[PDB]
Amino acid sequence: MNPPPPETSNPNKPKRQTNQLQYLLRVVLKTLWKHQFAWPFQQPVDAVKLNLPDYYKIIKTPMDMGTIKKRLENNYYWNAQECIQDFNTMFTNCYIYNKPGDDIVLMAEALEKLFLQKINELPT
Numbered sequence: 608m609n610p611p612p613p614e615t616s617n618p619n620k621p622k623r624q625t626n627q628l629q630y631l632l633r634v635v636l637k638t639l640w641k642h643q644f645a646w647p648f649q650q651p652v653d654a655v656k657l658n659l660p661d662y663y664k665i666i667k668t669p670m671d672m673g674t675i676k677k678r679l680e681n682n683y684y685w686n687a688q689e690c691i692q693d694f695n696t697m698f699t700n701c702y703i704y705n706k707p708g709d710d711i712v713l714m715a716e717a718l719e720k721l722f723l724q725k726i727n728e729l730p731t
């Protein structure tokens with residue numbers, strides 16, 4: 608019921624290190640990670656463990672902060688926007704699979720606001 612997790616390395620994809628990508632790891636990801644609502648998002652959704660057999664029947668581009676963390680540590684991204692897109696996919700997946708007012712959605716909404724707060728101003 609679980610697909611393979613998203614890749615964290617890809618040898619035919621070019622790598623890059625930028626000040627904004629370093630910030631996304633040092634400040635943005637590592638701050639969100641310690642939030643009281645971060646724990647559902649620190650690893651790929653396990654549909655067998657969590658008893659959610661339809662999760663990947665609904666979510667076709669899964670993403671989580673553990674994957675993002677590993678991509679940042681491997682310089683997998685070309686630029687900050689690509690990483691920001693992964694965060695946005697993670698949040699949107701949560702809204703798609705659930706419904707408004709759900710506990711998990713309240714968590715994602717709070718994390719998304721803190722995320723936007725932190726990426727509002729990036730290094731040059």
Ligand SMILES: C[C@@H]1C(=O)N(C)c2ccc(N[C@H](C)c3ccccc3)cc2N1C1CC1
Nearest residue numbers: 647648652657659662700701704705710711
């Ligand atoms: C799949 C969906 C989702 O989109 N994500 C990202 C996710 C990640 C970790 C968990 N673990 C427990 C079960 C939990 C249950 C309620 C409130 C917060 C956590 C649950 C979810 N939910 C499910 C609630 C329906």
